[PDB]
């Protein structure tokens, strides 16, 4: 009987509610086809989002709290549903409830109305939940109810476009610091995501990072067992070497670059594209960096990988390569040369990608200009591979910067 419940929920006599309560949240979780809608368009919502206030009757509140969190684990409009019916400052009320059963009732409710999407998540930042959910996070505390701390963290820390406020950044960090030595996969697993979604909100974010200390707790995780910690991880250390020298060099310091042979050769082509994507990054900085890639090593796997690795993998070389170009020394692009690296690079000028076009075209201008007496033998070597009739073809392509440079480049070097 839908209608007595609703009816004696509202009763003054709180023994009724509870039976009462108990009776909408056994048809609610008790079934697999629950009357959820039959429920919401029964008025009990306002009920039991008053119930949630009773402090003075934890089981009816566990109940109500209970009740609302599997609407809200529902579909879309169910979760709204819940969230219009002014749930969510009383959900972040329980979260400071003394009975456990409650908080993690709490927690999972919003959980799911994070999920639901932005504004949802915007909002529930804004009333201030993340100090009480980062309390959660202790030595005893349940994995189970663990993992949904950290699930909801992630998703606090996901919708980048909107960026987080700085000062819940500031709150966020040292339980990541924490949580980065846990054992369970997907507590790393949600750590590092959360990580690498703070560091890519910009250069003063990666800083924050960076002055929490968690980086050298981070960078072996590239070298971990199970590999979506490793895919995690390439990611926050990726865009933190987007930053400046300084901060790649913050990376660098804690030997990243010993875990690059194993995930250049890693049977994932992901991992070896977002590997190069990560050393492209490096070669980008100063001549110190563009050596310590050559040092360990790692310029033969790179070559190898621009000529016989997947395309999104071959696009990241390229870019590793030109990027070396910028303020690489005429010994270290020679190394380049030595290393067969012409073949390859210019096997990538007939490709439809115009961008891995241009950064070709620039890395081979580069070269070019770079040698000043060895110019006719790497133009030999330009010519032997085809990279001539492939340049002089780009002097008829659409896009400016393309046939501008093509152009430049025969003018200055095959005329």
């Given at each position: 009987?839908?209608?007595?419940?609703?009816?004696?929920?509202?009763?003054?006599?709180?023994?009724?509610?509870?039976?009462?309560?108990?009776?909408?949240?056994?048809?609610?979780?008790?079934?697999?086809?629950?009357?959820?809608?039959?429920?919401?368009?029964?008025?009990?919502?306002?009920?039991?989002?008053?119930?949630?206030?009773?402090?003075?009757?934890p089981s009816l509140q566990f109940e109500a709290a209970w009740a609302l969190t599997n609407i809200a684990s529902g579909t879309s409009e169910q979760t709204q549903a819940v969230v219009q019916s002014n749930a969510v400052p009383?959900?972040?009320?329980?979260?400071?409830?003394?009975?456990?059963?409650?908080?993690?009732?709490?927690?999972?409710?919003?959980?799911?109305?994070?999920?639901?999407?932005?504004?949802?998540?915007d909002y529930?930042?804004?009333?201030?939940?993340?100090?009480?959910?980062?309390?959660?996070?202790?030595?005893?505390?349940?994995?189970?109810?663990?993992?949904?701390?950290?699930?909801?963290?992630?998703?606090?820390?996901?919708?980048?476009?909107?960026?987080?406020?700085?000062?819940?950044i500031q709150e966020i960090l040292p339980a990541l610091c924490v949580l980065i030595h846990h054992t369970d996969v997907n507590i790393l697993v949600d750590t590092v995501w959360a990580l690498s979604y703070l560091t890519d909100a910009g250069n003063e974010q990666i800083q924050m990072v960076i002055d929490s200390g968690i980086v050298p707790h981070l960078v072996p995780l590239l070298s971990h067992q199970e590999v979506k910690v490793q895919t995690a991880a390439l990611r926050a250390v990726g865009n933190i070497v987007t930053g400046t020298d300084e901060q790649t060099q913050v990376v660098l310091n804690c030997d990243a670059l010993s875990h690059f042979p194993?995930?250049?050769?890693?049977?994932?082509?992901?991992?070896?594209?977002?590997?190069?994507?990560?050393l492209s990054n490096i070669t980008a900085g100063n001549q110190q960096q563009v050596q310590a890639v050559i040092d360990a090593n790692l310029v033969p796997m790179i070559i190898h990988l621009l000529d016989k690795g997947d395309?999104?993998?071959?696009?990241?070389?390229?870019?590793?390569?030109?990027?070396?170009?910028?303020?690489?020394?005429?010994?270290?692009?020679?190394?380049?040369?030595?290393?067969?690296?012409?073949?390859?690079?210019?096997?990538?000028?007939?490709?439809?990608?115009?961008?891995?076009?241009?950064?070709?075209?620039?890395?081979?201008?580069?070269?070019?200009?770079?040698?000043?007496?060895?110019?006719?033998?790497i133009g030999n070597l330009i010519e032997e591979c085809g990279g001539l009739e492939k340049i002089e073809q780009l002097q008829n392509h659409e896009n400016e910067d393309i046939y501008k440079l093509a152009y430049e480049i025969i003018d200055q070097f095959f005329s």
């Open positions: 009987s839908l209608e007595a419940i609703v009816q004696n929920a509202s009763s003054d006599n709180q023994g009724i509610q509870l039976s009462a309560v108990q009776a909408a949240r056994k048809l609610l979780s008790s079934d697999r086809n629950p009357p959820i809608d039959d429920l919401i368009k029964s008025g009990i919502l306002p009920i039991l989002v008053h119930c949630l206030e009773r402090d003075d009757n009383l959900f972040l009320r329980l979260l400071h409830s003394p009975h456990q059963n409650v908080c993690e009732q709490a927690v999972w409710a919003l959980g799911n109305i994070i999920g639901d999407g932005p504004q949802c998540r529930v930042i804004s009333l201030g939940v993340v100090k009480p959910l980062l309390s959660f996070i202790s030595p005893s505390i349940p994995i189970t109810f663990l993992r949904n701390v950290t699930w909801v963290m992630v998703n606090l820390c996901r919708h980048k476009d909107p960026p987080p406020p700085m000062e819940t194993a995930l250049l050769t890693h049977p994932k082509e992901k991992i070896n594209k977002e590997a190069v994507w990560f395309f999104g993998t071959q696009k990241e070389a390229a870019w590793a390569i030109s990027n070396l170009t910028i303020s690489g020394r005429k010994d270290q692009v020679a190394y380049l040369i030595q290393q067969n690296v012409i073949p390859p690079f210019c096997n990538l000028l007939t490709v439809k990608d115009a961008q891995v076009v241009q950064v070709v075209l620039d890395g081979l201008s580069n070269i070019l200009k770079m040698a000043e007496d060895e110019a006719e033998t």
